[model samples]
Target: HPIPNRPVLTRARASLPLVLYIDRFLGGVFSKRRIPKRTQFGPVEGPLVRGSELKDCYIHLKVLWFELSDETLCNWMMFVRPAQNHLEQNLVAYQYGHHVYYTTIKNVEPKQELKVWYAASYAEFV
Candidate 1:
């Protein structure tokens, strides 16, 4: 008689990195220098302030992944960099399944914006 049929199990495949492109503004004023001294842009949220002195700045971003509730998580590195050249490189921080990344640019003028690139990847069995 022939041998009995048997079942087989397979392991999950490895995950790949996912890339992303982002545009973010660091700390700096976005007002025209020619504006009247009496003119004010008013209060703003976060770091950037209107009608104020511009300063060197950087950006910080965070990402998280979870399955079914907030219990099981599958996360990895989150990288971020400037879209242009001649900028300081930033580092990525990883804690548990969360990732944080940032970058810095100097001598940014008013009415200026930058486009940055970022990516994230994770590998988990379904």
Candidate 2:
């Protein structure tokens, strides 16, 4: 199986018809077609860090973090912004077996922006 040794993207990298593009004011990752529930995204590809990290893009897994260490050298999943306080949020983020991944919690249609929780624990606090 191929591993995320680099952040570059390819057609095979995405499990869906996804795009990392801009929609006017900001840039984000989005699906170009309908996506089913529980569609998984990644064991997110990025550089790892051991100490204080940027909370902006850090994947909190235990005491370590996977963050965008290089802007142009990270996976498209790294481009996935955080979800707002949406009551109908579609994506969820998790740390399973030391890897970070994002999955759809509900079905989403074409052109919908893909967003993930900073940490699933946040939902419990909500």
Candidate 3:
């Protein structure tokens, strides 16, 4: 006798790295540049202070302290020529636009590391 059974379904999906094209300036750079600054009013906030010059390059700004992969993080940092006085700050600025990659690091702990990822879209909050 042929048995009537529910169809079995199997699926495999990859968690692809969500790519983003971001362009933004952090407090260090934004504060110094003469651009329209954002105003915080109550719970609502004003628009970001930015100019046309960097409008096409960066997207957003964030501060994430994490421990990074010494090997890769160091190499990536080297790849991008950061300003001497503002190496960390500049890197933070650079990561404000592009793709978000992951590593073991997640804090600024001793021997740990922190990096900023730059992308074009809003980063996942959860």
Candidate 4:
């Protein structure tokens, strides 16, 4: 019989060596094994909406925001949550040509949660 577990299914089928698991703290994306610096991921997959629609929840870029749609939560990138600061952030969210990407700034260890500093504008929340 096929496994009915969602995250398990996701981890098994995902191309990236990542996992979405819930711990006592919270659910976040984590590397399955060692990952080198400069490992890049994304133009993020999500619904486009105006920043007027929400705050702190969506990725607010210039003139617009990208909302995490239901289908977006299905993507491995969905669990790339924000980090508090440079020290906590192994990943960096870089915007280019209105597209967003997360690139690792530091080599990540196995089972380490992936976190990005999602631009300075949103830093207050961190």
Candidate 5:
């Protein structure tokens, strides 16, 4: 019997924001903050009902999606890096008919805080 060769699995290399890495990338924004910043809306006061918590922390986001130009649609993306040192990221696409969109964050662990990066492009137009 001969032993079969197998490659060890490793984590993917952390990716930098496209705007910083590429010259052509534009409309980029980055932020780092605590999740759930004092939840209240207008005349309402209550605990925020969005985002999952681990221990004592959670994540949440509010977005406004719209058209930038005839050629390109406004879009955004979010990334989270937990205390465990792994990165989780997601993309949001603008809907032509819907002007607003909602997204929820899940599985965020305590002590990691939140790091958010948003970017859009007019280069992908029709």
Candidate 6:
């Protein structure tokens, strides 16, 4: 997986103004950073998916439906076209909705800081 040598973006949920909530939500989940200033894929807007394609996509939707009842917070593998040079990459990604809360559940028993690294699920598409 290629590492994005970009500036890290951070913000508290309350700090963002109401008008920018939609933009912030998309940024926080999809890229986790603002565009141009940081490196990440831009969102793709599409019309209704249909026919055989819908059938194939629906299979995964069924699995997701069982795992989650609240439609808003569920993470989904969405199709996107990245603005980056790596056009060969699979754009299936997760969009964290506004209802979803991003936070760490810290275990007080362990004092060590848990590190998390982002890696692409390229193996599935490969």
lDDT of 6 by residue, 75-110 (tens): 221211122333322223323341111122222122
Stretches of candidate 3 exceeding 4 Å from the true structure: 1-62, 66-69, 72-75, 78-81, 85-126
TM-scores, each model vs. reference: 0.20, 0.67, 0.16, 0.67, 0.20, 0.19
Residue 44 C-alpha lDDT in model 1: 12
Off by over 4 Å in 5: 1-27, 36-66, 69-98, 106-126
Q: State the lDDT at 68 in candidate 6.
A: 24
Give per-residue CA lDDT, model 3, range 40-120, as digits (tens). 101111133333222322233333322222322222221122233323422233222232332211222222122334322
lDDT of 1 by residue, 1-126 (tens): 799777532211111122221223443123232222222110111222332333223223223221211111211111122344435312212223332322222333334432233323311210
Candidate 4: tens digits of C-alpha lDDT, residues 2-120: 77765644431363443334333756777766879998887676556666665574344442656654442435565567777667788877675566778888999977888877655
Estimate candidate 2's RMSD in Å: 7.6
Clashes of each: 0, 0, 27, 0, 1, 0
Candidate 1 yields a Cα-based lDDT of: 0.25
Q: How close is candidate 6 to the true structure, as a TM-score?
A: 0.19
Q: Which is the better candidate, 2 or 3, if ranked by TM-score?
A: 2
lDDT of 5 by residue, 1-126 (tens): 899887532111123323222112422323333324322111111132323331222122322222122112112221222122225332222223322222223332333333332213311321
lDDT agreement of model 4 with the native: 0.63
Ranking by TM-score: 4, 2, 1, 5, 6, 3
